[PDB]
């Protein structure tokens, strides 16, 4: 797709049996092709006894067929095709789609078409193949069982109530996957898989005459059988105020919404294209306005947004959603209904509509005179979109002319009328998500309409106007400090500078910095420092990171950085504070200047704070009764005895004030800093900027913060609380070992080989292991080899998995082969020399060096790292990866 190809020539056809095809010839990259077939059947067409059958047929048509009794995907493998790269399929509510990218492009077109015709017209759907395949469909189902899917099903259930969608999820049930016989799949195939229910599109380097012959060859003989007529794609819209709870015990969702459902494709006798353009203008106007209405929200509600979505072929949902402070759902739904009422009473901002309409006209103008040229993958993207909805493609040049035509028939009166139609839709829905165990009784419809009538009768202020944009500028800094000492490490190209405020600079003049300056500012101000309140310090760090300096805002901070191509981020860990940033060398004063302003003039953006409190509070409510909440608590007790700190109660959360947080930040900002600066410039250029912006920041000595250290010993625990049918097995082990680069390298090698050995030694598929992980490192701050072995598996033999891994660990130090080390040493040498000149690696090693030696020696003599990899050393270290004296085992089983 290197040279863009122009708008292609399209040829369409219909075989006698009703099979439709679309041929799209690109000047295109040479020989590349893309071949799609759609069968117009999805899970919505399943009957009550056919749960998930559409998706199972999708799998099964790659099995035995009349011409390939060993399976269609078997032959595809033989001829070089790869699962997911060369062939793929997807099933959704309404269609099943098969996609092919033959490895040899257009030369395999006949082969591809033979394969597709086999799948769609000659699949055997054999019981014996199905019993083999249902293990693969059950895995697909297990990996789909999280909170995100259960909540998605909650959303479909509510917003698509009174339709076929809620009872027809694509995957179907574990019962049907396990019990449904091939005979049911066969009847479904024979009901729906007929040529007039099918269409095919071929894109790329093709001769349309030749492709049409291959298509006649492989599809013309398929018998012309009708499929049932269907008119059940829409929810049954009726006047109503439905109330729903969106609920899952593992979800932190905390949210109210009010939703309008309506026929969105009805253009009311006017232009379909013009209608869609009215929708874009309106949604853009409403999106602009509803953001300004944030000023009107009470403390219980935030981030009110408007979202429009398809919920059928013709039905759409227009919804107002807002985040809710847990326990404030009643106040929040009222606040949402108040704003909806305000939109019913005032017209949309005329200037917004003027501007938005003008932006569109400028793009439609450019489109209408620019010749359309795209890369291959982009052509495929554009064309599949229109083809999936069974519509002809209209080029961007023609569509620019159509927009300009429609824009001439569109005044703000139309936009307002378009918008008020939506808000007058009689089919309505109110939704509540209330996290955890928050007291909640679902409002009755009358309670909701009561609030509607209260606001319909109320006096309401006009829509908010656009606020002036604040244009941030860094202050002038006239005071200067001084460098008071220089220590030189010429062999590493490093200078170390003491500054008058007690900070220091570690400056590496690395040519690899190019025309950029890289800053890492560290200090001992982690949130576990003695003077701080842990949770509040952490919230403070996050709020200042997003807000920027006192007189700025989160948004203006983000624009200002983009305009200077500059980054700077706060990260407060338990034991240290790191501010990291990059800028072009010409922007140095802006990088240092912003750094200093975060230190002495931090800001708290009131909207950011309100949003962060809601995030913390809904998570608190969820974590207090969630599975993950209990696992975190149990792992914490097993490994540490007590939590180092905790989140507060929601009631304390509500009371936190900006000055209390800024107090915490200033405590962190006062610990003295080491500036790791990587910049290829002369000292004379860097020193004045360091003395002006960095040596002038007030500091007081900080103490080193004690590490949170996992306790010695052997302890275990087993909890049957998992809501999904899986077992989670975690095991932790550690051995104190002094850190050196050599020792750290040996641990990583031992863990590579141990990873291989422990995965074959537990390779038996009867154990039921879905996922397995062996992690081990010589943690340099704690100076201990920490090892972590994780399993996710079927419950039945989960109690055997750690025993077998413990087994495999005891064997490992003698089973390690000289050949094993040889290929690791060789592959390490490859990665190490790939890391030469790597800025990230250089930065990390400069900081490691200073942490452990208080000098930059580690930047030299990386070459003799490889030399520490031997059989005798890797094995001596493989013995220390697991320490039976320090072993914590935690087993989560499905709930009883």
């Amino acid at each position: 797709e290197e040279i863009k190809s122009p708008l292609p020539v399209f040829k369409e056809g219909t075989l006698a049996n009703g099979f439709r095809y679309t041929l799209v010839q690109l000047e295109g990259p040479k020989t590349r092709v893309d071949i799609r077939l759609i069968v117009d059947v999805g899970s919505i067409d399943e009957k009550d006894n056919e749960s998930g059958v559409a998706h199972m047929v999708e799998h099964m048509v790659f099995r035995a067929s009349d011409a390939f009794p060993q399976g269609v995907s078997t032959e595809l493998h033989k001829q070089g095709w790869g699962r997911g790269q060369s062939y793929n399929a997807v099933t959704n509510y309404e269609r099943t789609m098969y996609m092919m990218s033959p490895p040899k492009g257009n030369l395999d077109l006949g082969a591809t078409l033979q394969a597709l015709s086999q799948m769609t017209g000659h699949a055997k759907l054999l019981q014996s193949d199905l019993d083999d395949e249902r293990k693969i469909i059950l895995e697909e189902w297990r990996g789909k069982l999280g909170v995100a899917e259960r909540m998605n099903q909650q959303r479909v259930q509510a917003i698509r109530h009174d339709s076929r969608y809620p009872s027809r999820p694509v995957i179907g049930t574990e019962e049907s996957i396990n019990d449904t016989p091939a005979s049911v799949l066969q009847d479904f195939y024979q009901r729906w898989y007929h040529p007039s229910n099918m269409r095919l599109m071929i894109i790329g380097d093709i001769t349309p005459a030749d492709a049409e012959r291959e298509i006649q060859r492989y599809f013309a003989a398929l018998p012309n059988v009708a499929v049932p007529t269907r008119d059940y794609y829409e929810p049954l819209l009726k006047p109503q105020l439905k109330v729903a709870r969106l609920q899952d015990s593992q979800s932190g969702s905390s949210q109210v919404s009010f939703v309008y459902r309506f026929n969105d494709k009805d253009a009311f006798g006017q232009s379909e294209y013009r209608h869609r353009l009215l929708t874009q203008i309106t949604m853009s106007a409403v999106t602009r306005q509803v953001r300004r209405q944030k000023a009107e929200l009470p403390q219980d509600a935030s981030s009110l947004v408007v979202r429009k979505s398809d919920i059928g072929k013709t039905t759409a949902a227009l919804g107002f959603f807002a985040n809710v402070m847990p326990g404030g759902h009643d106040a929040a739904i009222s606040a949402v209904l108040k704003e909806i009422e305000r939109f019913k009473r005032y017209p949309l901002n005329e200037q917004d509509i003027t501007e938005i309409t003008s932006d569109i006209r400028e793009v439609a103008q450019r489109m209408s005179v620019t010749p359309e040229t795209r890369e291959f993958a982009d052509w495929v993207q554009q064309l599949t979109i229109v083809w999936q909805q069974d519509r002809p493609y209209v080029g961007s040049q023609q569509r620019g002319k159509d927009a300009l035509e429609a824009l001439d028939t569109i005044k703000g009166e139309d936009v307002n009328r378009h918008w008020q139609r939506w808000l007058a839709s009689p089919d309505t829905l109110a939704q509540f998500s209330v996290p955890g165990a928050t007291p909640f009784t679902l409002p009755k419809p009358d309670a909701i309409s009561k609030l509607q009538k209260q606001w319909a009768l109320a006096t309401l202020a006009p829509l908010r106007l656009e606020e002036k944009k604040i244009i941030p500028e860094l202050p002038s800094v006239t005071q200067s400090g001084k460098r008071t000492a220089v220590k030189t490490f010429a062999a590493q190209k490093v200078e170390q500078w003491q500054l008058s405020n007690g900070d220091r600079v570690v400056w590496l003049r690395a040519p690899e910095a190019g025309k950029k300056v890289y800053l890492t500012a560290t200090s001992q101000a982690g949130f576990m420092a003695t003077a701080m309140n842990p949770w509040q310090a952490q919230l403070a760090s996050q709020l200042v990171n997003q807000s920027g300096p006192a007189t700025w805002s989160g948004e203006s901070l983000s624009n200002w950085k983009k305009e200077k191509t500059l980054s700077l981020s706060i990260d407060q860990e338990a034991d240290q504070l790191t501010l990291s940033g990059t800028a072009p060398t010409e922007q140095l004063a802006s990088l240092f200047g912003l750094y200093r302003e975060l230190n002495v003039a931090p800001g708290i953006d009131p909207d950011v704070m309100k949003e962060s409190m809601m995030s913390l509070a809904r998570q608190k409510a969820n974590d207090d009764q969630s599975v993950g909440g209990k696992r975190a608590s149990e792992m914490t007790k097993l490994r540490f005895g007590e939590p180092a700190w905790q989140q507060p109660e929601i009631a304390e959360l509500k009371k936190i004030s900006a000055p209390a947080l800024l107090s915490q930040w200033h405590k962190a900002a006062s610990a003295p800093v080491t500036y790791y600066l990587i910049a290829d410039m002369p000292a004379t250029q860097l020193l004045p900027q360091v003395e002006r912006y960095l040596a002038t920041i007030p500091r007081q000595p900080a103490s080193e913060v004690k590490q949170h250290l996992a306790l010695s010993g052997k302890r275990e625990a087993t909890s049957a609380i998992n809501v999904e049918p899986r077992a989670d097995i975690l095991t932790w082990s550690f051995t104190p070992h002094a850190w050196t680069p050599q020792a750290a390298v040996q641990v990583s090698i031992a863990r590579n080989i141990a990873s291989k050995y422990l995965k074959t030694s537990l390779r038996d598929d009867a154990l039921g292991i879905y996922r397995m992980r062996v992690d081990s490192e010589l943690e340099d701050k704690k100076q201990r080899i920490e090892t972590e072995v994780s399993f996710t598996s079927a419950p039945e033999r989960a109690q055997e998995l750690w025993t077998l891994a413990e087994q495999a660990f005891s064997e490992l130090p003698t089973k390690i082969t000289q050949q094993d080390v040889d290929e690791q040493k060789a592959q390490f040498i490859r990665a190490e020399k790939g890391r030469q000149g790597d800025l990230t690696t250089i930065q990390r090693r400069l900081i490691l060096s200073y942490r452990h030696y208080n000098d930059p020696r580690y930047l030299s003599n990386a070459s003799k790292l490889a030399d520490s990899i031997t059989l005798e050393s890797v094995r001596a270290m493989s013995a220390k990866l697991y320490n039976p004296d320090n072993r914590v085992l935690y087993i989560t089983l499905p709930q009883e």
């Binding site: 793009v363 569509r399 927009a403």
Partner: peptide, 7 residues
């Protein structure tokens, strides 16, 4: 949906 992409 966006019928004419602007950004």
């Amino acid at each position: 949906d966006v019928t004419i992409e602007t950004h």
